[PDB]
């Protein structure tokens, strides 16, 4: 027997990192009573098999780790020096401070006189990398405290691209899963590193390779991705639009779109109003003046019952599918080429072999993470691939679908949650000041008048009622809407998101900062200026595993602490594999994970630090009075603690709900007590709670279905690996969206080797039915209100079509395609000190900021300090040799790498001018390790994008000198 | 005897395999610089067993060939590290019989430590300037006689890393040798009847590292 692991207590897990959601085995010395032993890969589980890359490899070196926080630590105004302090003292002062300020800023009253109900002068950031069940409280502390200005990770490279596939599908997550990867007959990785960035995703990438998939990476650069590539194909920045503005044209000239599919189940036969146009770039409406659209002169026509009008022929020239061809003939392979930089031969050879998934016996996927979809146009490169996918009848089927990789850990669970500045939990809309009643917010909901469309958000009512009566059981719906905060009609939304508050941060009007889980001073663009704003802040709560260079900014380079007179508490968490929960991977499995390790000294999991800080403010305020205490005192915290503790089974079961009193919904009795078993069976008179009607059916009576480990399948999902009993996905558990889409109206699948769902003996066989019905009576996309997926998307700010508008300000003055050249719905300087096209991306040993992974010896023995990758071109313009320490700067700052010269790098070909750019990753702080280098943070720009209100991290001006 | 099949095709450079082998071994982490290279550690030494070599080969058309190379003892059948080391002391140097695996034990403090590594034609063992005792890969023997997989085996995501009795590895290279020959026409095992450490090389083995294959 193994002498390392003989008596210690093994336990399962889930990775922290990335969004794969890997399986990890814990040893605990002592039978669960001491530190951990080992941590590697969970053999059983179904999408990793006991694999795990560096940095899943090395969690046990991530907690037991001698540099973690041990205790509360207290930084007075002006001091210099942390002060080690209790968690009594450290959660009392905070609640002191978060009462003095929520009542010195508390407007029950807008400007207008409209209920508001909140505070402005209190922001939080994250956090992703909670539990599920702490994300979903954290969240509802806030709002009860009064905050809108509420957000984190999800905002900054995901918030810009979900759009995109709500207005196409008509939801914003990953269509499909990781294992579905392996089903796929050609894979396009595109705005991707999933290599790096997802890498036991590459399990799945390469076993489609070995069943004959065809595997494209489309990238400026080469990256470790593009060598376990069939296919690398070089694209200049930001000439995404263009590359699928050419495969829409190529795939509908070819006539190698799925007719049937295209027929049924997108909106190709809508006929589109008289008043679209598109002339010059321009589409029908635009305000010159206010450089916005007038999205109504792009509205269906209607039919005498309201549904819009339908020709099934396809032949009426305002059908979607006839206007889409007239939109895309412009983007011939030669103009594609010359903008993208591929070679005709190699956009020929990407064209054909992607489209040939049109058949319906092949099926093709696209994968994109973040890449370079942050700016203005980043929606509309999403929108034209799940074009691209609908016409390909690519959505619903297996090995298909716009998997969109999400980023960390619980990044999807963490907006399910609602920890975005604009949404609740279960993605009802935070109201706004003009929301006066419940009624009024749920009159907004659109309906739709055609028998066929399921319309799923008709149901709204009934999730907004349970969620309320989650958070205040006792009161009626209507009642307990008056409690939560409401943001401003009349204002912009971007105005509320992580931008903004950076701004509103740089001005003094924040007199406090929660900075939960998240490390603004390295994360967010100009770090100079940020560094420099967070000491305009009051005080600043920093919950972490490290100390770090937001919790320490007031030491951090050039500052002087006598001169800075924030007060900072940070209190240290627990890591993952030290507590008890759920996170949400990509594809939206549910996955619980157990505590191995007791909490490293005195650190305490986040949903305990939450709870009795918020416990602290609610008694203050139950002794002391002050500022609309009604919503801090009624909140529903009993149901969140057993134990004296914080305790996640009782918050997941919350978050699932159930009955507050016996009812009787959709023909079925069900007692007072029992969970509820679905969302469809939620209510809207109070008889039912749910903190997020996604997880109606996460946690039933049936058990913690999240916790499932069951690898049983039936033939027909062990052969697309489903794996319907390992654990839960939302929604229902079913794991491919937009199923119905994969069968023909008699229920059989277009492709029965790899079915999804097959109408057999009255019934659904196989993954779970994305909406009921029988064969033919529905629409596929349950979500959408019109039920189809929509190649015309009149919901987007510029345009019901994707459209090329130059994303580089600087090096580009010609669009070949249109008249305009930029986003007109959206000053760069382009200084010529700075010639060089700056970009930041990742590599596959370090996570995000580094805050982690640079405490982790083992990866920063594999990549240890911050680098600078040139082309040799760029290098022998520069006179810079290999592994030589240059200077990179730009207006925002400068910093200093070891340069790495490499062919992975070329030049780009734009308007005859050879155009240089360079990388860096933003995996570095000065805080550790030595010699690793800061941000590069310190040279992106804080102008951000007017559309999205994300500042620019992958292409910004810099230089680069020898040292 | 056991033996690895190491598919370089499929390698996407990860480096989870140089992590969980010091995870397993609780091996400390060198003191490391970027002198122009994702390479880290730039060599084996004697608190490393493992590091992933990088190479960048130019090839016209657009890319690179980016060669990774995750460098282990190759367990020879017939070692002649043991034979060295058997001149100065016999028991410094252990064939596990059942395995196959070469094992270094604490008398290689004992004999002399750079004839051992000389003889070695794929320059594997380190010494520890200090206890001049001699470490390598030990093809992680412990989970090995216990059922389980070496710790680069079991965390390999791609199916790179493979581990079985010697019989049926050499049956899985001849089959892949031959399917990946069709996208890497170069393709080559390196020494495949001397070895259990059988790596799959996509083209020339002397473009991975210089000791790629004897
Ligand atoms: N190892 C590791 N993995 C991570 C992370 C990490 O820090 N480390 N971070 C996680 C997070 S939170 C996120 S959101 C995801 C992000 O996942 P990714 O999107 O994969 O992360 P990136 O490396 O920043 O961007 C990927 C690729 O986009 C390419 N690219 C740049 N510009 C363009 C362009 O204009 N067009 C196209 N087609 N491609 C372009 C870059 O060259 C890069 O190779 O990764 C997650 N995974
Ligand atoms: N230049 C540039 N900037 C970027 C990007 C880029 O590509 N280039 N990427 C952007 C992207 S996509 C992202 S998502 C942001 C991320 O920005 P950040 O969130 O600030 O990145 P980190 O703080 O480093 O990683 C998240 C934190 O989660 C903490 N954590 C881990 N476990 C727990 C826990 O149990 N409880 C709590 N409270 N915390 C925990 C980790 O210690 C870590 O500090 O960076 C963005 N900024
Ligand atoms: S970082 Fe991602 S791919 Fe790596 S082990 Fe963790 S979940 Fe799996
Ligand atoms: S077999 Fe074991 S000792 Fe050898 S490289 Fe792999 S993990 Fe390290
Ligand atoms: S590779 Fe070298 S050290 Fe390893 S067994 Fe063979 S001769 Fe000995
Ligand atoms: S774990 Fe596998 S894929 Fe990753 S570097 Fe090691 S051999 Fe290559
Ligand atoms: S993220
Ligand atoms: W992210």
Redesign the pocket.
Known sequence: ELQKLQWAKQTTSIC?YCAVGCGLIVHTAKDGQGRAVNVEGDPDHPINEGSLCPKGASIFQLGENDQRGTQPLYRAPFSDTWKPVTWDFALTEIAKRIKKTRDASFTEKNAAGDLVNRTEAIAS???????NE?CWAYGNILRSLGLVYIE???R?X?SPTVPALAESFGRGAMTNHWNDLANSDCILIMGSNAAENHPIAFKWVLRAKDKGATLIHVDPRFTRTSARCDVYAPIRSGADIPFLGGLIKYILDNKLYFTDYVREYTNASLIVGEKFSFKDGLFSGYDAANKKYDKSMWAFELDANGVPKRDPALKHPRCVINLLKKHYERYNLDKVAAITGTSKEQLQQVYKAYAATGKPDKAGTIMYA?GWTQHSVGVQNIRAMAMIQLLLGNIGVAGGGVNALR??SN?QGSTDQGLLAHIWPGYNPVPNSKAATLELYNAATPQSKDPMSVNWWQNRPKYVASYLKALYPDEEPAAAYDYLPRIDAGRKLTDYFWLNIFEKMDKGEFKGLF??????A????NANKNRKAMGKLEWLVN????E?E?SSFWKGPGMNPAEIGTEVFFLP????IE?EGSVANSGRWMQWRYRGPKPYAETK??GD?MLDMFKKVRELYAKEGGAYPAPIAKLNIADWEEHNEFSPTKVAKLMNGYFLKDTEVGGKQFKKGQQVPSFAFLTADGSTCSGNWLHAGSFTDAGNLMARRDKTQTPEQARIGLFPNWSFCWPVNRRILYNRASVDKTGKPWNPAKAVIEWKDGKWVGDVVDGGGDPGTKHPFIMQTHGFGALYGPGREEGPFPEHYEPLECPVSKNPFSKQLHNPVAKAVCDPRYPFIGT???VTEH??????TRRCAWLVEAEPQIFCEISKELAKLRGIGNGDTVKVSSLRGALEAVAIVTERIRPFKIEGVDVHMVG?P?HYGWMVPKNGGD???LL?PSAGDPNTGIPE??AFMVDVRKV | GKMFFVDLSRCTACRGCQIACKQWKNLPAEETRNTGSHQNPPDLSYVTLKTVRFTEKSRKGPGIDWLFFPEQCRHCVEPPCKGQADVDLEGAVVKDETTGAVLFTELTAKVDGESVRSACPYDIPRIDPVTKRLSKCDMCNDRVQNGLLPACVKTCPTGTMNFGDEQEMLALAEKRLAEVKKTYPGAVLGDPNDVRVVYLFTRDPKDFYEHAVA
């Not at chain 1, 390295?522 to 663009?525: D, F, M, P």
């Open positions: 922290c950031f994250g956090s992703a990398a909670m539990d702490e984190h990770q999800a900054i995901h973040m980023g960390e990044v900075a939960w889980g998240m490390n603004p390295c994360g967010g663009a919950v972490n595993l490290f770090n937001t968490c627990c890591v993952s507590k999991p986040d630090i930041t991306y990742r996570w995000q900021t580094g805050l982690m860096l933003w941000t590069a943070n992106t991290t992958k």
